[PDB]
């Protein structure tokens, strides 16, 4: 209702330039349709979350190797 409808989900304002190692990453999930910029959020084994562009070649490879977050 009103304010809660404005910005309720995590969005990507920028993407990771340097490719990430598969050994440190645990899962992946895409950004909400509500977000201005599309992309995926890589969940590391460490716990921290990293943005990435879905159009990138190294990102498309990591999505194949990793599962979707539960």
């Amino acid at each position: 209702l009103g304010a809660s409808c404005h910005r309720p989900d995590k969005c990507c304002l920028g993407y990771q330039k340097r490719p990430l190692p598969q050994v440190l990453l645990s899962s992946w999930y895409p950004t909400s349709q509500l977000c201005s910029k599309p992309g995926v959020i890589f969940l590391t084994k460490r716990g921290r979350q990293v943005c990435a562009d879905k159009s990138k070649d190294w990102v498309k490879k990591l999505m194949q190797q990793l599962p979707v977050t539960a």
């Binding site: 209702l1 304010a3 404005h6 910005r7 309720p8 990507c12 304002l13 909400s32 201005s36």
Partner: protein, 438 residues
């Protein structure tokens, strides 16, 4: 060195501390307050009819507030039916309240500008036109709240919002709300106020036209200074051309000492501003000026034009009774003054105006035509005072979406925290009506 997403968790803890207190106070004040109004008004004045329409429209939204409090801090559990029900009541309250105030502005316009015979248009408006012009379009604007308002899952929790098929629907209802609920009622209230004060200032001009007298030529004062209109002094200078040039500068037009009734009124209004600004600066005249009506002020301004700021200030004995509202006791105590025997015809017209509070002491028409303006102007200004910090938040947030202001995650969440708290505080307009009785 890693890129992180924009976490909205910093907005979640903000709402969980500040908003539960705000939604609790406004709920209790809006249910005890407006609850008593409907029981006292409806069961057992003209503007009181519109306040009955207002106290029922906001009360319907007060019983809707417990749902607003839970959605802002926790999650939406209530379901899809309550989701549409809350959205419809919110749409009704947004356009009904803002157009009831617009109809209040129209009621004051008819009661002040066309008071001669306005009992019929004022009745027709409050008894019939109010339903056709306020409640019928308000219930007709709830159609999208029956189509697009529904519950949806978003990341962490469920959200009850209006979901449109594409961005073209989002931007047309975005611009529709600004017109019907902010610009169009704003024009109606502004255009009423601007022609009510225009009438009020004209009534003083015709009042002093009778007393002092209108002169469309440059004439010499009792003291010998060059004057024009209703006692408007041009210069203390003994030169005619100096005053003639001073007149051309004040008007803008190259006049040869000749001015029109309209030009004479423009100069008059300028002299009233100077007299009012000086009166509210005087320690013995300022606590009296605010206590008086609209016609009783005109009679006090008349005394200032006749004697002066220093002269009127010498009525310390009479000004004390003038605040105590003992109008019959003050007039008999002011009739004994040397001012009354200095000029008897002008003084009797001014003292009977202070005694009764009627402009009919000069006008050859009706009697006891007194109307209140002070409770209205407060209610409308205090209404926009609640919404002003909320519409500031949307304006800044709009530039972020229009790609004019492009900053980080922190600034993006700062405007949200501003909107989230100013939305909760903007609902105080529900409590505004019963609190105005104090």
């Amino acid at each position: 060195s890693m890129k992180e997403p924009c976490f909205r968790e910093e907005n979640a803890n903000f709402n969980k501390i500040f908003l539960p207190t705000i939604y609790s106070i406004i709920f209790l004040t809006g249910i005890v307050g407006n609850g008593l109004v409907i029981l006292v008004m409806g069961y057992q004045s003209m503007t009181d009819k519109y306040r009955l329409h207002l106290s029922v429209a906001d009360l319907l939204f007060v019983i809707t507030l417990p749902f607003w409090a839970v959605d802002a801090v926790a999650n939406w559990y209530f379901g899809n039916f309550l989701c549409k029900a809350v959205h419809v009541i919110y749409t009704v309250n947004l356009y009904s309240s803002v157009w009831i105030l617009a109809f209040i502005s129209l009621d004051r316009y008819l009661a002040i500008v066309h008071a001669t015979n306005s009992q019929r248009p004022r009745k027709l408006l409050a008894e019939k036109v109010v339903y056709v012009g306020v409640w019928i379009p308000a219930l007709l604007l709830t159609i999208p709240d029956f189509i697009f308002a529904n519950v949806s899952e978003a990341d962490d929790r469920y959200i009850c919002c209006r979901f449109y098929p594409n961005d073209l629907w989002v931007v047309v209802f975005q611009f529709q709300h600004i017109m019907v609920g902010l610009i169009l009622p704003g024009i109606v209230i502004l255009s009423c106020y601007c022609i009510i004060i225009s009438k009020l200032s004209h009534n003083i001009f015709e009042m002093l036209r009778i007393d002092e007298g209108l002169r469309l030529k440059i004439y010499k004062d009792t003291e010998g200074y060059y004057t024009i209109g209703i006692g408007h002094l041009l210069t203390k200078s003994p030169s005619l051309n100096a005053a003639k040039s001073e007149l051309d500068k004040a008007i803008g037009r190259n006049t040869n000492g000749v001015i029109t009734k309209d030009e004479a009124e423009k100069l008059f209004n300028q002299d009233v501003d100077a007299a009012v600004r000086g009166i509210l600066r005087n320690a013995k005249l300022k606590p009296v000026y605010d206590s008086l009506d609209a016609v009783r002020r005109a009679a006090l301004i008349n005394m200032v034009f006749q004697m002066g700021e220093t002269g009127v200030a010498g009525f310390t004995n009479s000004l004390r009774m003038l605040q105590q509202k003992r109008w019959d006791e003050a007039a008999v105590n002011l009739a004994k003054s040397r001012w009354y025997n200095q000029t008897p015809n002008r003084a009797k017209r001014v003292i009977t105006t202070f005694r009764t509070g009627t402009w009919d002491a000069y006008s050859g028409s009706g009697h006891q035509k007194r109307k209140a303006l002070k409770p209205t102007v407060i209610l409308i200004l205090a209404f926009f005072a609640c919404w002003l910090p909320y519409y500031i938040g949307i304006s800044i947030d709009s530039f972020i979406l229009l790609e004019i202001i492009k900053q980080g995650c922190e600034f993006e969440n700062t405007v949200h925290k501003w909107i989230s708290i100013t939305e909760a505080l903007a609902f105080f307009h529900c409590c505004l009506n019963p609190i105005l009785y104090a």
